[PDB]
Amino acid sequence: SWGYREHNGPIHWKEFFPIADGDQQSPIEIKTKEVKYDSSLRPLSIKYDPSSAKIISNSGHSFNVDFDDTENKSVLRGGPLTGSYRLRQVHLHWGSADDHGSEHIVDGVSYAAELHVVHWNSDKYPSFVEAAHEPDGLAVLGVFLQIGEPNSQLQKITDTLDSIKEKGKQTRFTNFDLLSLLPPSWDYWTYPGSLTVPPLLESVTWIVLKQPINISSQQLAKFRSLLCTAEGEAAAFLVSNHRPPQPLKGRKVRASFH
Ligand SMILES: Cc1cc(=O)[nH]c(SCC(=O)c2ccc(S(N)(=O)=O)c(Cl)c2)n1
Ligand SMILES: [Zn+2]
């Protein structure tokens, strides 16, 4: 099965999922002199209910905070989006070293990690599952992490990781104030792309915030202790789980600011 190890990592994914070589793949290099300022883009309209968070799990590929998306308590609107995108899931990407952990790269600068906040278009689709197969179905907010002072909201996640070390394990997790976790500035870049993991579907409107948030080196290192392997399998650690940048193939990256 797919992963980030030598045999099963990003270079080999095209072997099980050919769209890995598609024309709208993510992540990408963001080259700021090539981005087009677009005055029709709107500021982000963000509403996240801290009670929406319910469970945190180890998928084998990252941790997932899953949100109750039964109704429209936590939604993203504005930005490049038409209509209302419902919060589903938060997860993180990192690398084995603090200087190279993010998926999107900005003029060659990788960050220490990158948080993804995944939402789905419930104004057009009846479920996440249906939305995930259409070009306008998903919207992902990408937030960079840089090493700095410890982050008291991320401490809440790190404190759970010992209880979910094995692939498949879950624990309850709620009262998570995702709105306060975001950086001061919500200036962003946006482009049409894909999931950055298999099945790599080309259904995502990416919204990548320019300003990073801080995490300490000790908090970040805790994520690398997660196993990519299940209880009863030979242990291997998820030291790195970021996909390299993919060809832009003529897509327009736009900025909400200039
Ligand atoms: C978000 C979610 C909930 C769920 O129940 N199942 C799944 S399958 C994984 C998936 O669809 C997915 C994974 C990664 C991403 S990412 N790395 O943020 O481009 C996305 Cl948009 C979607 N994903
Ligand atoms: Zn992701």
Numbering used by the authors: 4 to 261
Paper text:
CAs are zinc metal containing enzymes that catalyze the reversible hydration of CO2 and dehydration of bicarbonate. CAs are involved in many physiological and pathological processes including pH and CO2 homeostasis, respiration and transport of bicarbonate and CO2 in various metabolizing tissues and lungs, electrolyte secretion, CO2 fixation and biosynthetic reactions, bone resorption, calcification and tumorigenicity. Analysis of previously published structures of compounds bound to several CA isoforms, together with four newly solved crystal structures of CA II with compounds 1d, 2c, 4c, and CA XIII with 4c, revealed that all compounds bound to CAs in a similar mode but with significant differences that may be correlated to differences in the thermodynamics of binding. All compounds bound to CA by making a coordination bond between the sulfonamide nitrogen and protein Zn atom.
There are three crystal structures of CA XIII with 4a, 4b, and 4c. The 4c structure shows the formation of one hydrogen bond with a water molecule while 4b – with three. This change may be the reason that causes the increase in the entropy as methyl and oxo groups are introduced in the pyrimidine ring. The compound binding affinities to CA XIII increase in the direction 2 → 1 and 2 → 3 → 4. The ΔbG change in the direction 3 → 4 (incorporation of chlorine) is relatively small, but the enthalpy becomes less favorable while the entropy – more favorable. Incorporation of oxo and methyl or dimethyl groups does not affect the binding affinity, but modification of tert-butyl in pyrimidine ring changes ΔbG to more negative by 5.8 kJ/mol.
